[model samples]
Target: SVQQQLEALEKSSGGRLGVALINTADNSQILYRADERFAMCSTSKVMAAAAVLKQSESDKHLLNQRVEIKKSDLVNYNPIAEKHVNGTMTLAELGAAALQYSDNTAMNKLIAHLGGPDKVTAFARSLGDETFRLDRTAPTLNTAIPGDPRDTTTPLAMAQTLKNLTLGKALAETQRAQLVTWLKGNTTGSASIRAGLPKSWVVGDKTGSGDYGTTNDIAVIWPENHAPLVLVTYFTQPEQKAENRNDILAAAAKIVTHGF
Candidate 1:
């Protein structure tokens, strides 16, 4: 079966790989030790964003509401670096920039507005994510300032969060819609799950990369006449060439999307 081949390939890669596949319609599933955990990297932002939207929905906050981008708000990440260099942006713009551009500054600002790492962690738990945590911000934080915050999460928890959002079970309809909109705006690189899909297919998801040693992507793949599938991959090892990692992920995605 394709699943067996995936396991073999993952084993050959010499790094931890965990996968979970769920049929969007019937919900029948397959697991390749999918419950195991790994550092989620920037993928944590999906949960963090959902948490903020949930709060906003409850308090009647508007998604279009503008929030200032501050030096402190610009957490360590590419978008932050760009914004810091290029100039300012609004809350909605920052969210879009963060996901689409994989901007660290935008995420840090969102994290700050959401009330820091603790609140983000709490919000994840509120949605029933037991294994995820925002241990600190990303390494870009350190380069941006004297001290950097740390952030961490497991692959399984990431899958859970995405599943919850897609099913509209985590937040109110309006909030879920907003998060989904933000997710769709994610135009960053297509290295992991996105690399394997047909060009016509659209994936609403997020990617997370780190300098210390982490790369991950979590997404929902909706194919014509097929049950939508959730594909999440987390990689950790001495930094290999980005091409190597992309090849591994693209292969895995092909098997998941086309083989099974």
Candidate 2:
């Protein structure tokens, strides 16, 4: 039934859809095109943020360390960072901006702070995910080229990495909680997976969108009296300028969660 429902949904989708739903407690999963590579877009911010936290475990002072945001660093879609240009924000604030608001400027600053895109990718690999990769910053990183391998990750890899950073052992307890806190505070994902989730179940997520119909939501959800679920949904169409399908993503989430 689950397979049929998901297949029907994908058939009706205007673009390709990828889903990976992992039961965090038992690791049971429901996958649809789960291992296929998709654009990371801004969803990569979560990993970059987590990498910052990973380094914080040893330094302890990285979170509070203040950094300045110059006008030159701002990108086109920087909602939070644009406001704070020529001002200073703590590393924690940057992480929150990147995660909750999907602020491109904040994300680039975080990546640069962590050393670079390659360093962040290295950190992701160190967490046991071999498919996640980040080779550039915002605007550029969100290129979403159809077959280009730069800055892409599979649905399964994205979901697993989300679990590792938020609920697994890759980061210390405190750092993990911080990452979860920022994600839970995210303001950009209401139209996607969160819209389909039932009420009162704890949830935290990051969303991303780019060219060619690219739209994604990766989440850690807790159902009442049940274990957490890690869900990742990515959709990309063949059209060069296809519109984002947030409602499609929401429908997919509803189908998968209800199936479980």
Candidate 3:
């Protein structure tokens, strides 16, 4: 079933995309993929958030802890404050904002608070994600570390992380639950993965979009009776049109769900 879906994606994409689906319960490989090593955009935040939760667990920190969003903490994509005015937020609130809004500013602030971009990368490596990398810190007035424009990852690695998060093996139960809760609340306008699911189906996910023709999503989909599954899709092109982008993503998700 998924094979036909991949063929359709290959046809529609002009052969420029990678798709991977793994049934988390049995650890069985379930789909086709190419060039698994792709630059992850905000998708890397899943790793970042997981690492922070792990560290907090070891240090006996609370997930509901508050961390104010200072003026200095503001980064590139702060939608909460952008639409509204100045405000304060908790660590939990920021984490929620980061996922739900895909708030780049919120993510950068979390990265900074957790240490820095390098620290986040190191954390991921420590957790065995050797290929994932955080190439840039959020931009600031004095510090203009140019973003790689592409954060790198593999579909396999993302599936593993999702599996870990689901089983509460990546972090403490509470911490993992907290992250999953945030993921469930993700309201980011992009609907690549979730678009394919039944209204009753529940998915916790993150999406990334880059100017260089990349639109990717990784999600944990839990369907009744069957075991949970991790579905990841990564796409890139020299150039892409808006319709093409949505079409490719929708096609990919359908392939993963209905096809399989």
Candidate with top lDDT is 2
What lDDT would each prediction earn against the true structure? 0.67, 0.90, 0.68
Superposed Cα RMSD, model 2? 1.0
Ranking by lDDT: 2, 3, 1
Q: Give the residue spans of candidate 1 off by over 4 A.
A: 70-76, 80-88, 140-150, 238-244
The 10-residue segment of model 3 with minimum total lDDT is: 140-149
Following a full C-alpha superposition, what root-mean-square deviation does model 3 have from the true structure?
3.9
Across 104-159, the per-residue lDDT of candidate 1 in tens digits comes to 77777778788788888888888788777676655432111112234554555667
Ranking by TM-score: 2, 3, 1
Which pairs clash (backbone N, Cα, C closer than 3 Å) in model 3?
Answer: 39-151, 39-152, 40-151, 40-152
Off by more than 4 A, model 3: 61-75, 81-87, 139-150, 240-244
TM-score of 3: 0.85
Alpha-carbon shift of residue 118 in model 3 (angstroms): 1.6
Give the top-scoring candidate (TM-score): 2
lDDT of 2 at 33: 93
lDDT of 3 at 90: 61
